[PDB]
Amino acid sequence: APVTHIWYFKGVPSRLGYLLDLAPKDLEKIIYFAAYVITSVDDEMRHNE
Amino acid sequence: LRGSRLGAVSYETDRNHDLAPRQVARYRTDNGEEFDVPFADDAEIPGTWLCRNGLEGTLIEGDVPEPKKVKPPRTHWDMLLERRSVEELEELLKERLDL
Amino acid sequence: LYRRVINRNNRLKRLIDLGAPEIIVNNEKRMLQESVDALFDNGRRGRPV
Amino acid sequence: FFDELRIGLATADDIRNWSYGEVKKPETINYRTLKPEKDGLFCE
Amino acid sequence: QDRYGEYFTGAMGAESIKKLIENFDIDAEAESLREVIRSGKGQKKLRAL
Amino acid sequence: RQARKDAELTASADSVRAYLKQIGKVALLNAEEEVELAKRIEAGLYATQKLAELAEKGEKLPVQQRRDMQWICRDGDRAKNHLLEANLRLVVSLAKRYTGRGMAFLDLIQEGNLGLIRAVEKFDYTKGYKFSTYATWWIRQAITRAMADQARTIRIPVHMVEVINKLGRIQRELLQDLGREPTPEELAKEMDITPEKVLEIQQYAREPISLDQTIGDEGDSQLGDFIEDSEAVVAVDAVSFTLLQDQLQSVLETLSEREAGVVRLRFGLTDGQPRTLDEIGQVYGVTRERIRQIESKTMSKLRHPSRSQVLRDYLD
DNA sequence: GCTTGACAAAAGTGTTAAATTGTGCTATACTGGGAGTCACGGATGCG
């Protein structure tokens, strides 16, 4: 399974967090199997009436 | 103390201008990559090899596929047949006919 | 440390084969991430091994 | 000859290229006869 | 997921972050930050910078 | 402030604390609710295989039964998942026995989960026994097999670690009989094996230490700085051999023409492949015994001190 | 500059026995750990 280099997950600044625009704790929850995150969504069922 | 390395050192005459003739073979891999191996003068032509990328490969020339085979793995179904006969399973399938 | 990876990876390779529940595979992947993190730089997360 | 030293961020393909083999097994050396195993961390 | 799990994609762990960085575009946030630094006055300017 | 909050800030980075709370999201099943699940699993599996058995020939079936069979398969899969999830607490209870014996606690829990899986693929309601009673044995099997297979840097196989454990338990237990740590005599008197094999076992049970330990009453030196290499190349020898190659092959060889030519092939000095008599008799037009005769002549002439005086000093 | 032949020791073939290594299996019931804090600069927000 994929894995993320620890040097970039955290370190003040967290390069990954700034890159993706997620807070360190929110990013921590995603990487470490504690919360789900939406990768993408299709407009064909968001702007469809 | 003295330490060991499970090895040894030798110093005999190295050279390149005189060499034994290589026999070069190439192997295609199930992941799409190809690799090369130089063999000795014995003229051996192995049909299968294990490559650097951790995946097995077979000679590009393509001789004698599937050189050898091993017992298939056991499965939950076999592990069930070892403790039940087909009649009971058919009876259960009948028992699950409707809701 | 390398072994702690090669073990946890290998078992994961088995768990995917068996089609184990979501909890089992999620825990295995979390342990794999933690082991790789320990391998690269120990002590920046949690207690050191 | 040395002119400058570059330090990039290695990708997966570079890591694959740097290796001539894959460690598919966790043993280091055989407990008996003291030789490396066929797929261990010390494989010849 | 049960009621419209077909409309989107959600994931957890380092795999979902792999996807997030995959779909992330460098050319997108750069302009947003360049505008926010000068457009903003207070803390937002520092965050964008 | 930080003083109070720090004790819980790290709580999110402790899988031992978090897994044992995420685990208990399903109530433990009882006897009445597991026979149904087992039967449903069996029905689903049998239907799934019957699809293939029939497809070996190929036929069409009613839509109602066609959908009911797939429903049975899916819901039996759900039953299996539920049964697996319902006993992870027992898995943890069993696994927490082996904490501290090499393997990591969470790894032990995972191996107990594997044992639980293999147990559920054999638990048989028809015998009327409980799932816990049967599955405990398989959980122990898996956990102990793993703990004996990969709890050491050097893999002592299952059959060998077995006898190692026998020896350890006997050595620990027999002390109370006499008040001493048993020696090879006492150990052999009860292990049904001779002392030399016992010594070999004790040597085999050895484990490697780490080089990174710091020695010297300071954190400056290390255990490993003073490791003398027995394989390191010595320059003088590297020189000496070359001189020999420039003294033996170059000078002394060039004194008997074809009579010295046999030495080139006989000892393989020019290629590295030593040759037998006949093998180098047939390159010329002479028999193997003729090669032996000329070799004897060369040995007698070269062995004489008048020439050996120069060559002797290397290992005189 | 060297052969015929005859003997005994060393280098190979093959079958068999013994040991060594790997996987599976055990059915009363038991169901979720436990280990000896402060100081520093940076992100957030107040006017």
Structure tokens at A21: 């625009």
A–F contact (≥3 CB pairs within 8 Å)?
A: yes
- Residue numbers in A 14-43, CB below 7 Å of strand G: none
Give the torsion sign (CA, F40, F42, F48, F51).
Answer: negative
Check CB contact of D21 with chain C, cutoff 8 Å: no
Torsion (CA) A22, A23, A25, A31 in degrees, nearest 10: 20
Residue B80 in contact with residue F120, Cβ under 8 Å? no
The label of the residue with tokens 């470490």 reads A32
Instruction: Tell me if D35 and B6 make a contact (CB, 8 A cut-off).
Output: yes
C-alpha of F84 from chain center: 30
CA gap A21, E29 in Å, rounded: 9
Structure tokens at B44: 């051996």
Across-strand partners of B34? B28
Q: From residue F140, how far is each of B13, F121, F170 by CA, in Å? A: 59, 16, 22
Q: Measured in angstroms, what separates residue F273's CA from nucleotide G12's C1'?
A: 19
Residue spans of beta strands (DSSP E) within B4-94: 23-29, 34-39, 48-50, 56-59
Alpha helices in chain C (DSSP H): 2-18, 22-40
CA gap F279, F122 in Å, rounded: 67
- Per-residue flag: F138 CB under 7 A of strand G: yes
**Exposure of F179 in the CB half-sphere (CA atoms within 13 A):** 0
β-strand F228-229 against B2-3: which pairing, if any?
Answer: parallel
Give the torsion sign (CA, E9, E15, E19, E21).
Answer: positive
CA gap A4, D9 in Å, rounded: 13
What residue has its CA nearest to the C1' of G11?
F276
Residues of chain D with C-beta less than 8 angstroms from the C-beta of F153: 28
Length of chain F: 316
Residue C42 in contact with residue C48, Cβ under 8 Å? yes
Q: From residue F295, how far is each of F260, F265, F298 by CA, in Å? A: 8, 11, 5
Which nucleotides of chain G are near protein (any atom < 7 Å from a CB)?
1-5, 20-34, 37-40, 42-47
Check CB contact of C3 with chain F, cutoff 8 Å: yes
CA gap F126, F120 in Å, rounded: 14
Torsion (CA) D23, D27, D33, D38 in degrees, nearest 10: -30
Residue of C4, C6, C9, C36 to mutate, testing the D interface (most D Cβ within 10 Å of its Cβ)? C6
CA gap F308, F296 in Å, rounded: 16
Contacting residues for B54 by C-beta, under 8 A, at least 6 apart: D21, D22, D24
Partner residue opposite B76 with nearest CB, options F68, F121, F241: F121
Residue of E12, E15, E17, E18 to mutate, testing the C interface (most C Cβ within 10 Å of its Cβ)? E12
Residue of F155, F158, F162, F204 to mutate, testing the D interface (most D Cβ within 10 Å of its Cβ)? F155
Nearest Cα neighbor of C38 from F104, A23, D43 is F104
Instruction: Tell me if A6 and C26 make a contact (CB, 8 A cut-off).
Output: no
Give the torsion sign (CA, F69, F70, F71, F75).
Answer: positive
Residue A20 in contact with residue A27, Cβ under 8 Å? yes
- Per-residue flag: F64 CB under 7 A of strand G: no
C-alpha of C49 from chain center: 13
Length of chain B: 99
Q: What is the DSSP letter of C25?
A: H
Nucleotide with C1' nearest the F276 CA: G11
Resolution in A: 3.9
Angle between helices F35-55 and B86-95 (to 10 degrees): 110
Residue C28 in contact with residue C12, Cβ under 8 Å? yes
What residue has its CA nearest to the C1' of G21?
F157
Angle between helices F158-178 and F131-149 (to 10 degrees): 100
Across-strand partners of B39? B23
Q: Catalogue the long-range contacts made by F303-311 (C-beta closer than 8 Å, 24 or more residues apart).
A: F307/F252, F307/F255, F310/F247, F310/F252, F311/F247, F311/F248, F311/F252
- Residue numbers in F 250-309, CB below 7 Å of strand G: 284-287, 289-290, 293-294
Share in percent of chain D as helix, strand, coil (round to 5): 15, 5, 80
Q: Measured in angstroms, what separates residue E48's CA from nucleotide G38's C1'?
A: 33
Instruction: Tell me if F153 and D31 make a contact (CB, 8 A cut-off).
Output: no
Give CA angle at C24 (F114, C42), nearest 5°.
100
- Per-residue flag: F60 CB under 7 A of strand G: no
Residues 1-40 of D with CB under 8 A from F: 26-32
